[PDB]
Amino acid sequence: AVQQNKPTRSKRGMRRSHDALTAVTSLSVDKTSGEKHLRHHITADGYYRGRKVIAK
Amino acid sequence: MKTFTAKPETVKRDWYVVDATGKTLGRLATELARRLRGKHKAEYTPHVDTGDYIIVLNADKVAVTGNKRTDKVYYHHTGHIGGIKQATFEEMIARRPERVIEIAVKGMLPKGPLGRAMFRKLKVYAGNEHNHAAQQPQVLDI
Amino acid sequence: VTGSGKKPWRQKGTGRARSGSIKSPIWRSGGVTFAARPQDHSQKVNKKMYRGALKSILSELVRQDRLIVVEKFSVEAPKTKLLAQKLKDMALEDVLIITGELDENLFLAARNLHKVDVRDATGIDPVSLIAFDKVVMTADAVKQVEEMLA
Amino acid sequence: METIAKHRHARSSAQKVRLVADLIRGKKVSQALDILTYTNKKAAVLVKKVLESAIANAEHNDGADIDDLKVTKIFVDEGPSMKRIMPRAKGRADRILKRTSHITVVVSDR
Amino acid sequence: VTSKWFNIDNKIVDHRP
Amino acid sequence: ARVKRGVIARARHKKILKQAKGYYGARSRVYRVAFQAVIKAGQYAYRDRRQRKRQFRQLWIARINAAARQNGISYSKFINGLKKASVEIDRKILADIAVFDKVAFTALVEKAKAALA
RNA sequence: CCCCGGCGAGGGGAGUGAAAAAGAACCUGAAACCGUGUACGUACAAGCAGUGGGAGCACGCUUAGGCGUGUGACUGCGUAC
RNA sequence: ACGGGGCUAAACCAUGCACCGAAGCUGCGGCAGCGACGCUUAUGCGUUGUUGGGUAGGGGAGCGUUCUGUAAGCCUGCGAAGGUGUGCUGUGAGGCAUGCUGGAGGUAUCAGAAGUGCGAAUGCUGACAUAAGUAACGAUAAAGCGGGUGAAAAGCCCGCU
Ligand SMILES: N[C@@H](Cc1c[nH]c2ccccc12)C(=O)O
Ligand SMILES: [Mg+2]
Ligand SMILES: [Mg+2]
Ligand SMILES: [Mg+2]
Ligand SMILES: [Mg+2]
Ligand SMILES: [Mg+2]
Ligand SMILES: [Mg+2]
Ligand SMILES: [Mg+2]
Ligand SMILES: [Mg+2]
Ligand SMILES: [Mg+2]
Ligand SMILES: [Mg+2]
Ligand SMILES: [Mg+2]
Ligand SMILES: [Mg+2]
Ligand SMILES: [Mg+2]
Ligand SMILES: [Mg+2]
Ligand SMILES: [Mg+2]
Ligand SMILES: [Mg+2]
Numbered sequence: 001a002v003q004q005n006k007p008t009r010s011k012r013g014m015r016r017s018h019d020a021l022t023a024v025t026s027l028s029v030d031k032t033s034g035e036k037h038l039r040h041h042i043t044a045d046g047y048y049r050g051r052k053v054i055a056k
Numbered sequence: 057m058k059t060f061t062a063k064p065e066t067v068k069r070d071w072y073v074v075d076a077t078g079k080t081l082g083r084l085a086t087e088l089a090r091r092l093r094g095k096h097k098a099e100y101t102p103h104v105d106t107g108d109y110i111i112v113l114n115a116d117k118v119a120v121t122g123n124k125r126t127d128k129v130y131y132h133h134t135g136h137i138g139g140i141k142q143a144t145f146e147e148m149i150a151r152r153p154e155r156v157i158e159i160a161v162k163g164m165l166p167k168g169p170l171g172r173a174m175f176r177k178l179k180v181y182a183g184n185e186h187n188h189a190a191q192q193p194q195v196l197d198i
Numbered sequence: 199v200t201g202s203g204k205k206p207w208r209q210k211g212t213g214r215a216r217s218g219s220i221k222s223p224i225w226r227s228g229g230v231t232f233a234a235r236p237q238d239h240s241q242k243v244n245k246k247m248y249r250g251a252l253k254s255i256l257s258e259l260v261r262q263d264r265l266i267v268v269e270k271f272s273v274e275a276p277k278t279k280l281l282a283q284k285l286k287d288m289a290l291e292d293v294l295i296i297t298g299e300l301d302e303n304l305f306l307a308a309r310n311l312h313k314v315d316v317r318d319a320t321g322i323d324p325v326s327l328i329a330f331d332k333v334v335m336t337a338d339a340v341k342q343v344e345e346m347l348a
Numbered sequence: 349m350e351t352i353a354k355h356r357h358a359r360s361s362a363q364k365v366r367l368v369a370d371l372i373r374g375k376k377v378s379q380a381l382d383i384l385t386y387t388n389k390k391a392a393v394l395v396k397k398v399l400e401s402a403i404a405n406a407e408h409n410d411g412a413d414i415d416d417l418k419v420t421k422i423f424v425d426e427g428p429s430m431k432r433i434m435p436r437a438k439g440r441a442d443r444i445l446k447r448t449s450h451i452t453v454v455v456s457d458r
Numbered sequence: 459v460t461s462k463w464f465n466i467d468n469k470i471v472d473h474r475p
Numbered sequence: 476a477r478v479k480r481g482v483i484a485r486a487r488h489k490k491i492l493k494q495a496k497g498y499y500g501a502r503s504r505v506y507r508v509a510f511q512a513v514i515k516a517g518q519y520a521y522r523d524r525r526q527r528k529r530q531f532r533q534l535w536i537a538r539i540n541a542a543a544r545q546n547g548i549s550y551s552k553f554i555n556g557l558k559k560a561s562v563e564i565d566r567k568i569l570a571d572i573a574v575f576d577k578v579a580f581t582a583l584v585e586k587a588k589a590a591l592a
Numbered sequence: 593c594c595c596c597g598g599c600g601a602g603g604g605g606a607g608u609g610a611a612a613a614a615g616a617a618c619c620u621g622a623a624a625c626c627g628u629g630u631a632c633g634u635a636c637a638a639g640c641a642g643u644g645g646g647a648g649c650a651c652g653c654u655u656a657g658g659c660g661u662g663u664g665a666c667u668g669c670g671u672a673c
Numbered sequence: 674a675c676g677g678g679g680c681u682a683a684a685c686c687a688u689g690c691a692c693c694g695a696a697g698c699u700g701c702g703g704c705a706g707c708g709a710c711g712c713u714u715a716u717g718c719g720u721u722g723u724u725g726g727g728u729a730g731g732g733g734a735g736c737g738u739u740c741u742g743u744a745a746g747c748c749u750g751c752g753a754a755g756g757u758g759u760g761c762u763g764u765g766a767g768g769c770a771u772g773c774u775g776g777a778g779g780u781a782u783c784a785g786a787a788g789u790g791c792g793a794a795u796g797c798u799g800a801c802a803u804a805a806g807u808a809a810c811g812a813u814a815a816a817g818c819g820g821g822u823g824a825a826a827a828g829c830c831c832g833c834u
Contacts, residue, residue: 006803008500009626019806021367024386038386059531059567060574063647064666082679089678098542098573102534103646103667121681128679163678169637170666211461215795226798230788239786312745329743353596354603357617362626363806373628393825397597404596405604423628428617439459451602452628477788478739482755484790485622492623497663499641505624507792511673512642519643519670525696527644530668534645536693551692 062101069177071109071188072196077117081160084118087198089164092174105170111179111186111193116153120145130159154180199229248324249347255327256343269337271295276306285314292331296322298338319343349410350420350456353402357427358394361447365391365424369451377403377417377455395422395451402453416457425450535570542573546584556587 028039031050037043046054072091076084090096094106120128128145148156157180165171179188186193199221206217223231259265273280281304285293295316297304308314315326319342327333335343358365368391372380377399384396399419406412427448434442464470488506494516495502495509502512540550548556557564562583572580 003804009802012803012805015805019367021371021387021389023371023383027382027386036382057571059534059645060571061646065647080680082683085679086683095537096541096544098538098545098577100538100541101646101667103665105666124680160679165678166667168667172636173666211465213795215797217797222797224794224796228797232788234788325742352604356602358602361806366627398603401596401603408595409605421628425628426626476740476786478790480738480790481622483738485756487790488623502641507673510792511640515640515670515672516642522696523644523669526669529695530644533668533693549692555691 060099062099062104062106064104067099067104067106069106069108071111071191071193073111073113073186073193074196074198075113076157077114078119081118081120081156084198085157085160085164088112088161088178092161092165092177103170105173105177107174107177109177109179109191109193110196111181111188112157113181113184113186115157115180116149116182118157153182199227251324252322252327253347255324256347259327259333264332266290266332266334267337267340268334271297271304271334271336272301273303273307276303278307278310281307281314282311290332290334294326294330294333296333296335296339296343298336298342319346349406349412349458350454351402351406351410351412353398353405353453355394355398355449355451358449358451359446360391360394360449362424362426362449364389365394365449365451368392368395369422369424372399372419373422375419377414377419380419395453398451398453399455402455406455412455412457417455418457419453420456421452421454423452425452532566535566538570538573539566542577542580543584546581548584548588552591553584553587556589556591557583560586560590562586 024038026039027036029036030043030047033043033045033047035043035045037047042048042053046052046056074084074088088110091110092107094100094104094108097106100106125145130143130145130148131140132142133140143151145156158175158178161178162175165174179186201219201221203219206220207214209216219228221228223229256265273284285291292313295304295308295314296319297316298319300316300318304316308316315330317326319339322343368384368387368389371383371387372395375383380399381396384392384399403414403417406417407414427450429445429447432444432446434444436442460466491506491513492503492509494513497503498509498512501508503509536550539553543550543553564583569580569583572583
């Protein structure tokens with residue numbers, strides 16, 4: 001099926017009232033490196049919870 | 057000169073208490089609907105609610121004439137196919153007596169958002185007691 | 199219009215409006231509906247209406263003292279500065295000079311003056327008598343115009 | 349003082365880039381740079397580069413300080429679309445639009 | 459292009475003869 | 476002599492779309508829709524110039540009827556008594572005194588009662 | 593020439609010029625269409641979305657006041673071409 | 674199977690007096706058509722009577738646009754046309770003045786000629802929407818990891834499965 005009348009720019013932005021992205025709120029800092037990472041993720045230089053887990 | 061218009065914030069509203077024992081149902085509802093709307097006031101404006109607050113006591117003692125007590129039927133539909141329900145005047149008084157006065161007055165009020173705000177000013181009780189003594193209602197011998 | 203006589207699409211079934219030609223004047227780059235041709239815009243004037251208008255025009259110039267009559271108007275050399283100085287003395291700037299027979303010196307002396315036209319008595323026309331501010335006739339051109347005007 | 353950076357003819361629909369740009373509107377730049385790092389959107393890579401670019405302009409050209417800057421304005425405009433052909437069943441052809449965008453970021457300390 | 463296949467088919471088109 | 480319609484057509488369209496300010500949706504943006512809306516707005520405005528006279532008089536009668544019954548007489552008997560007393564104030568002014576000067580209005584009701592009685 | 597960027601695309605300065613919002617996608621740069629900002633309205637309310645009445649709010653005015661501009665709760669009538 | 678609420682009259686019959694009720698009639702202000710009669714017109718003024726819903730269709734009077742003459746005139750880099758606002762003005766199509774943009778043309782008056790006015794034609798051309806960030810991403814033979822390069826590697830190169 002297909003529409004009988006063209007939907008308005010208001011009905012189009014009401015449908016999109018739920019499409020908004022939500023930001024990450026909790027950005028944790030490592031205890032030794034002191035830098036930021038996602039919670040429960042290793043830091044970009046290979047630390048996790050104070051210990052160097054990955055020598056890359 | 058423009059015709060005077062009542063202003064929703066400045067309008068003055070008073071409280072009245074009515075006893076409904078022995079009064080005919082319809083011939084009391086028309087007096088309520090006049091005063092809920094404010095038709096008794098020189099400042100009456102069609103788009104402003106200028107009426108008064110009214111407490112109706114003894115809603116279960118209201119009277120009807122003829123055989124209306126057994127033969128007046130209230131219908132409503134529940135929204136589901138086949139959902140046509142009915143109640144006679146006698147069993148509305150038994151089950152919920154206030155709805156009888158409220159239903160009657162509601163059909164005599166204007167429809168739309170203003171007629172719904174007028175209906176909020178009517179307080180119907182089945183008994184002789186009310187809780188609004190702090191509002192100091194006046195007796196309305198109507 | 200250059201093109202083909204082919205029907206752009208079939209008569210029925212395509213869901214588009216009916217077309218029969220790409221040269222249709224409804225289409226972009228199609229023909230003009232009532233295209234022009236070369237035409238002749240000349241009208242007829244009765245001889246008596248043409249001569250009657252000259253007499254009305256001529257008598258108005260006299261009435262508005264825009265007509266000036268002399269018997270002496272010529273220049274000794276075909277020099278534009280000579281005629282321009284002559285006209286300065288007479289207090290004329292925009293002027294039609296009508297002469298019995300046209301001299302070559304006066305014709306050549308006036309070609310470069312754009313406010314001055316010089317004519318023979320046979321070459322007057324209605325529009326030029328109304329256009330110029332003043333008209334100067336030699337009294338031998340005043341003669342010939344009246345026999346021409348019967 | 350206000351400083352501007354643009355990315356014109358960015359290759360993404362404005363509706364897709366607008367989702368990312370609404371996240372950092374009115375944020376401090378240090379806060380907005382961390383938000384854009386942890387957003388799993390392609391447009392977040394585009395928006396961040398314009399944000400870093402506008403930050404550098406503020407230092408070099410205008411003598412501004414990073415710690416004061418804030419994302420004052422950000423908006424995404426539609427750009428020209430490129431038109432392509434996609435062939436469908438039974439000999440029909442469709443027109444594909446490859447939409448672009450213009451991304452503008454304004455930072456200011458005030 | 460040509461007509462849609464259901465608009466050519468007699469069974470679909472000719473339902474009320 | 477070819478004439479181009481561009482400059483005249485634009486100004487004629489801009490005249491209609493300025494009268495369509497405040498309308499919803501295409502009615503303020505699109506000429507085919509704004510034209511029909513500006514016509515119907517003029518049809519209503521013509522029709523509602525007659526009705527403005529009917530709706531205000533009907534309002535004055537209701538405010539006289541309300542203030543008169545506060546003095547013990549209905550509208551239909553109040554107006555009749557003013558005719559027998561040869562008082563010629565129109566309803567626009569009576570509805571004005573009812574609200575703003577209730578002591579003058581009482582004097583009018585007594586005059587109506589005296590003539591009617 | 594400098595700066596961000598991938599020795600990018602794109603941009604911000606500097607400079608030329610009367611003009612660079614004349615920057616090569618370059619005179620003018622309308623409308624549909626899409627956005628950002630501000631003022632008002634809008635989450636108990638039923639329909640050609642206006643019109644007649646109309647409170648409140650915001651911004652200007654000018655005075656011993658109510659006028660202008662925007663918005664429009666509520667209300668009568670109103671089934672496009 | 675009263676429009677509804679409600680009604681034992683707020684129903685029906687008879688009599689009466691109020692009042693509401695329309696763009697009807699009256700009041701006030703304005704405009705025009707047609708008659709009649711006259712301060713006298715010189716073809717307009719004054720009074721009076723009356724008329725003014727309109728499709729097919731007939732008659733009358735105009736607005737605006739492009740081009741020609743008037744015009745080697747007039748306005749214009751002290752800012753033209755065009756664009757975009759605001760204010761005033763006419764019974765209407767319209768007109769006039771000005772702020773901002775624009776950056777070199779425009780054109781009174783009175784006549785002349787028209788490719789002279791668009792919302793519709795399943796009209797023609799270009800631009801841009803909607804459905805909608807939705808279906809789909811083309812054989813159900815199938816991938817996994819380590820190293821390299823690189824701004825970035827599921828897909829590129831090497832290796833082993
Ligand atoms: N229905 C089939 C066969 C088909 C092709 N063309 C048609 C025309 C009419 C009826 C059926 C057909 C298809 O679309 O592939
Ligand atoms: Mg051609
Ligand atoms: Mg001949
Ligand atoms: Mg094929
Ligand atoms: Mg340009
Ligand atoms: Mg609400
Ligand atoms: Mg009456
Ligand atoms: Mg009336
Ligand atoms: Mg008529
Ligand atoms: Mg034409
Ligand atoms: Mg039409
Ligand atoms: Mg489409
Ligand atoms: Mg869907
Ligand atoms: Mg789905
Ligand atoms: Mg899918
Ligand atoms: Mg594949
Ligand atoms: Mg790998």
